[PDB]
Write a protein that binds this DNA or RNA. Sequence first.
DNA 1: GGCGACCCGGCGCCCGCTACGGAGTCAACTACGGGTAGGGGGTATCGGGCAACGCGGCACTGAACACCGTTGTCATGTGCCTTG
Length: 48
Amino acid sequence: VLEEVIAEHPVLLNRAPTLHRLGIQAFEPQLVEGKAIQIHPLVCTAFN
DNA sequence: GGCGACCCGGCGCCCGCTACGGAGTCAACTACGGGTAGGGGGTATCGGGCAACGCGGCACTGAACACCGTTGTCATGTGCCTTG
């Protein structure tokens, strides 16, 4: 049910310093095993 | 005697979040007096447990009439035979 419900629902990833407005960026969530957030390498450098 | 430095006070702040330890500490006293509060003791008041007894449909009570149906019944009318 969780896999069914999360889709098409944004979540705002945000890093602590949030120096500039790209510190908060919406994303499409996606269930994944493990316990660490998977993030796209391209958007990393915007978050520093 | 307002300028003047200087002096001093006095104040103002001092990136972000999660997540990440515990620790807890030194010097009066008694007497009274009330009042509240507790306890048990006893008492008026409210709440819980049962068969008749309210109902109603219908049903029986058929009893007592009613509704046709029937073969009871009668006094009174045709057809043949005997006599005018």
